[PDB]
Design a protein around this ligand. Structure first.
Ligand code: F12
Ligand code: F12
Length: 358
């Protein structure tokens, strides 16, 4: 890379790895639209396997950006509308509390208090129905935001029903393949297991366990190269040839709700750029097990704003990921690690790098 990029990346990330005791890390910087890659450490400590540009990391909740864009693409196809009632796509959801809860509300965590996690005891599909039928909202729809896998997870599941494709097949054919993300997976194939990093939690090697709505909320695994391509695609969507996918990306970066300085997209979250680094560093949270926030509706939503800090954090038990980009500056970063280390340290490092290059 240009020496400036080399130096800011290394001077930020070396100390981060030391301080956080991260076994392995990969970083991509997108600068003037071109990617530059960096790797450190171990994908598998026991087997002494290094992190490489081909190593697969669990994205955790960064997966929600894929779900939001896949939903955006279904909207663009005319298959679904965000104003549609949830019950249009799950007619068995007859319980009256669902009256008035739209796909928008599911996608944006504003349904009225759907919980962070789908319970482990929810195995079967009938368990899933029972779970949602019995859930009682604390709040009216469109009034408070509570970040929730059970919310965006169900959005993803419903969004693909008109297509008749499984969520995985829809994601593959409509998002991964067109964008040439050929090493991005909901289920890691045997061919790629050699490249699948272990996550580390309390020193133990761990991979994400199966759960209801996992694919839709937290289940993608990817390489630093594919994630750089993901950022490039999101930086310049109107350069994507597939018309519905281009529109879906723009829909996912549109601003639907505001809480403080932050705006809620479909998967993506956004702040106006230039951002106050304290507004995103400290705002990256999560350490807080549950933070319920009143939201202001943006009526109608603001189409994707170029002058934004667009970002998403993600974790699993053994991994911590972060993506941020600024369309206006054709600048972005991806940080993938096989330890779940504090969000504020992620955002701080990302800020330092992008601020230096801006
Ligand atoms: C900045 C911010 O959070 N504004 C909010 S949250 C809920 C309502 C409003 C408002 O401005 O009405
Ligand atoms: C999606 C998921 O499993 N997330 C987990 S497991 C343990 C911690 C976390 C997190 O997101 O902090």
């Amino acid at each position: 890379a240009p020496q400036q990029i080399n130096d800011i990346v290394h001077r930020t990330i070396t100390p981060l790895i030391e301080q956080q005791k991260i076994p392995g890390m990969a970083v991509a910087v997108i600068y003037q639209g071109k990617p530059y890659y960096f790797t450190w450490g171990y994908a598998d400590i026991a087997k002494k396997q290094p992190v490489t540009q081909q190593t697969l990391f669990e994205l955790g909740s960064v997966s929600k950006t894929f779900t939001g864009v896949l939903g955006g693409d279904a909207i663009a196809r005319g298959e679904i509308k965000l104003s549609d009632p949830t019950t249009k796509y799950w007619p068995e959801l007859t319980a009256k509390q669902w009256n008035g809860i739209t796909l928008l509300h599911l996608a944006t965590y504003t349904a009225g208090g759907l919980p962070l996690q789908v319970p482990d005891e929810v195995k079967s599909s009938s368990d899933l129905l029972r779970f949602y039928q019995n859930w009682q909202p604390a709040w009216a729809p469109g009034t408070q935001r509570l970040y929730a896998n059970s919310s965006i997870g169900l959005f993803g599941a419903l969004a693909v029903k008109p297509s008749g494709l499984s969520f995985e097949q829809a994601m593959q054919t409509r998002v991964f393949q067109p964008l040439k993300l050929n090493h991005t997976w909901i289920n890691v194939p045997p061919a790629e297991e050699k490249n699948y990093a272990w996550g580390y939690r309390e020193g133990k090697a761990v991979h994400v366990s199966p759960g209801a709505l996992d694919a839709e909320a937290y289940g993608v695994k990817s390489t630093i190269e594919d994630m750089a391509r993901w950022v490039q695609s999101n930086l310049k969507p109107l350069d994507i040839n597939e018309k519905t996918l281009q529109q879906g990306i723009q829909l996912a970066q549109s601003r639907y709700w505001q809480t403080g300085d932050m705006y809620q997209g479909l998967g993506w979250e956004m702040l106006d750029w230039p951002v106050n680094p304290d507004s995103i560093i400290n705002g990256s949270d999560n350490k807080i097990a549950l933070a319920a926030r009143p939201v202001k509706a943006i009526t109608p939503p603001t189409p994707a704003v170029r002058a934004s800090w667009v970002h998403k954090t993600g974790a699993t038990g053994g991994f911590g990921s972060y993506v941020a980009f600024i369309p206006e500056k054709e600048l972005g970063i991806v940080m993938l690690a096989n330890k779940n280390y504090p969000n504020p340290a992620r955002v701080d490092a990302a800020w330092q790098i992008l601020n230096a290059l801006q």
